[PDB]
């Protein structure tokens, strides 16, 4: 019956493709061709945070748009004061092979993980005056590539063993394990309502999970290579994923298929980070070509370049008020662009 | 600046601490140790005393940080750039055992390791000699035409391994170990100092 099951799977895939191609009456470009372009967007380096000595792999903005946490392979996670360039904390990590970091929405906690397969939670507001490790979550057999705080108590992690998990920081046991990816899950982004999230893996596909029931609601596959970043549209009904195919694509949850792709002939390097603007009009994508490009997400035309980094930019983030965008890079320098 | 002066002073203090840790940690030599399974990596890493296994030892006023990453059961491409700044690569080959050739070709021609020089170790010399005395060396190599002696077979294997590199900015230091010795630390130290001298001499506009 194995051949029958394979034939059934092929027929289901063909039905999915036919249904998706039935609803594509018109493309996004033919609809947004009637709107005015944003024009040239020049952003200047307002601040430069020179504290890290090794390559920076992650950054995250605080919910107050002022505090930022950055992680490097020097073994340090530093919380920054963006307005005054001051450093408020300097957390030494047990393992220096860290490839992700997170800032809790409340602001009392930070997370950090990497090649040690353990996600570590740090308490920032301890009564003893220092920062202490509240929890060390160890349930992954592969490197943790991303992590995001649902609230002060639960955190969702993405690992390189083709799984994403939902944790309970109080007890340290995986509440829900999400399975179905064929390759390493390299990115993750929780929705604004925080009821569902998307994960981009190395199997050139992005699956739409939901934390409550743990079932892959939808699967999007339009890329040609490994997906390195993903980010939810501010409306929460769409997301953009940038892959190593030197392209990024916009997928619609309700339409269930890709809408636009942001590619250029003179771009060969793959994306490392993707982030949106407060209004969802700009799509700032970080590239391995040492530069960050700003894409007019409705017209799929480039609107600017955030040049000024001396190495590949590994992380990009936009504050919650949309005032500024911060870019980390392997040259151990983070810059605030406004 | 009412009490923001105290915040600034705390920031300066922690920046001074950061520079102190950076200065202290800049004296370590980071070596990425690779090879196939049961190739002698564990044997030699403990000769000088589950995500990543790190071993540290000190030889002649140099701190050698040795990383074994063979325990990562995932594709190298997604995390191998974390080791782009290693001083060298220590490759272990079991002479008395094709997969190693493919692994060496993949790791020596990587985009992140174009300039990183490898240190090649050929362990199990005595076992290789015994196998040669028992079995011909053409079993593993169909295209090997020559004498069935130990020296020429070892030289042929070393040449086959060194044929896999193309860049002229890197060198392969091939050393043969019988595993009944404690000289591996000296070989690693000499290779490391030679690599450092070569890199510095490149950086001086003199190479």
């Amino acid at each position, epitope marked *: 019956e194995l051949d029958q099951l394979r034939q059934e799977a092929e027929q289901l895939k063909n039905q999915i493709r036919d249904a998706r191609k039935a609803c594509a009456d018109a493309t996004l470009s033919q609809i947004t061709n009637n709107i005015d372009p944003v024009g040239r967007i020049q952003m200047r380096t307002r601040r430069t945070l020179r504290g890290h000595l090794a390559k920076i792999y992650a950054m995250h903005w605080g919910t107050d748009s*002022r*505090l930022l946490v950055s992680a490097s392979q020097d073994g340090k996670l530093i919380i920054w*004061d963006s307005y*005054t360039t*001051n450093k*408020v*904390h300097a957390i030494p990590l047990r393992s220096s092979w860290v490839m992700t970091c997170a800032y809790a929405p409340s602001g009392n906690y930070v997370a950090c993980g990497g090649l040690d397969n353990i996600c570590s939670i740090y308490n920032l507001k301890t*009564r*003893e*005056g*220092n920062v202490r490790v509240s929890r060390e979550l160890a349930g992954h057999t592969g490197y943790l590539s991303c992590c995001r705080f649902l609230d002060d108590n639960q955190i969702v992690t993405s690992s390189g063993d083709t799984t994403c998990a939902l944790w309970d920081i109080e007890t340290g046991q995986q509440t829900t394990t999400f399975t179905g990816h064929t390759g390493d899950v390299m990115s993750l982004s929780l929705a604004p309502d925080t009821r569902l999230f998307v994960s981009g893996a190395c199997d050139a596909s992005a699956k739409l999970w939901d934390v409550r029931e743990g079932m892959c609601r939808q699967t999007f596959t339009g890329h040609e290579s490994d997906i390195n970043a993903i980010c939810f549209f501010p409306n929460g009904n769409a997301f953009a994923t940038g892959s190593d195919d030197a392209t990024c694509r916009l997928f619609d949850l309700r339409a269930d298929q890709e809408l636009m792709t942001y590619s250029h002939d003179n771009i060969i390097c793959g994306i490392t980070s993707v982030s949106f603007s407060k209004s969802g009009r700009l799509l700032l994508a970080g590239y391995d070509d040492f530069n960050c490009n700003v894409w007019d997400a409705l017209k799929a035309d480039r609107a600017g370049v955030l040049a000024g980094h001396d190495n590949r930019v590994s992380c990009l983030g936009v504050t919650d008020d949309g005032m500024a965008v911060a870019t980390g890079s392997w040259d151990s320098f983070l810059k605030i662009w406004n | 600046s*009412a*009490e*923001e*002066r*105290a*915040a600034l*002073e*705390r920031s300066k*203090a922690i920046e001074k601490n950061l520079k102190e840790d950076g200065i202290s940690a800049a004296k370590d030599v980071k070596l990425l140790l690779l090879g196939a399974d049961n190739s002698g990596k564990s044997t030699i890493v403990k000769q000088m005393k589950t995500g990543i296994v790190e071993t540290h030892f000190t030889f002649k006023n140099l701190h050698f940080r040795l990383f074994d990453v063979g325990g990562q059961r995932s594709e190298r491409k997604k995390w191998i750039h974390c080791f782009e700044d290693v001083t060298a690569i220590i490759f272990c080959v079991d002479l008395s055992d094709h997969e190693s050739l493919m692994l060496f070709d993949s790791i020596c021609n990587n985009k992140f390791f174009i300039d990183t020089s490898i240190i090649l170790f050929l362990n199990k010399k005595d076992l290789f000699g015994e196998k040669i005395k028992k079995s011909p060396l053409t079993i593993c190599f169909p295209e090997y035409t020559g004498p069935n002696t130990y020296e020429d077979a070892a030289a042929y294997i070393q040449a086959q391994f060194e044929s896999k590199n193309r860049s002229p900015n890197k060198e392969i230091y091939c050393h043969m170990t019988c595993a009944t010795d404690t000289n591996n630390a000296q070989v690693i130290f000499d290779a490391v100092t030679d690599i450092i001298i070569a890199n510095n001499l490149r950086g001086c506009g003199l190479y």
Partner: single-chain antibody
Amino acid sequence: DVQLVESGGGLVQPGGSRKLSCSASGFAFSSFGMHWVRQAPEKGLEWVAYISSGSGTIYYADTVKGRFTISRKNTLFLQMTSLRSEDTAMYYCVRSIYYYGSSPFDFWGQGTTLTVSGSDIVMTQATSSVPVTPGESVSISCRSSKSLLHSNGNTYLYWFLQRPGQSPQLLIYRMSNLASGVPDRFSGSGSGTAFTLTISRLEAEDVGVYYCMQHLEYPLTFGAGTKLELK
């Protein structure tokens, strides 16, 4: 737990010298700035000296500069020299870690009773005693000679509570932020120079004396002290 215990108090002849020790345990003492706050037997609090983290910057009171010395084993010292008749008081040990969003003056020491045989911001509490009954809303007020609002939007007014027979405890820092462990019944508000603390649903444990303090510039000046009493 956090513990700040003082020792070195006793009868002192006038014109002599003494040293006060502050043994600290339960927190990272190295990263905390330490203050010395003294209170006369019948009067309010009066800031004395402050030593920052790493012994970087030290500030002294006008009536204290030259005579005293502050130094910080996990212990804080105060070298008192040439003690006058006005130096008799109870001296407190206060920890005041400073960074963005921190809560200075959060924990106060027990205190040691020592008995001896011009441009400063003046903060005045108009009412020195207020009769109040449990379950009602009591509003204490404070005023400042100079505006406490800074260019960054932070107003530096702190509200403390001294229960009878107990050391002061921080309630509101920067005039609007509630401290850690303080019940929600306390609120703070103010505008530049006039500040107000509102207590809702007053209980039996909320009785005591309330002091308003400024942290805009040293020396830090305390309020006169409004004493709330039951019935």
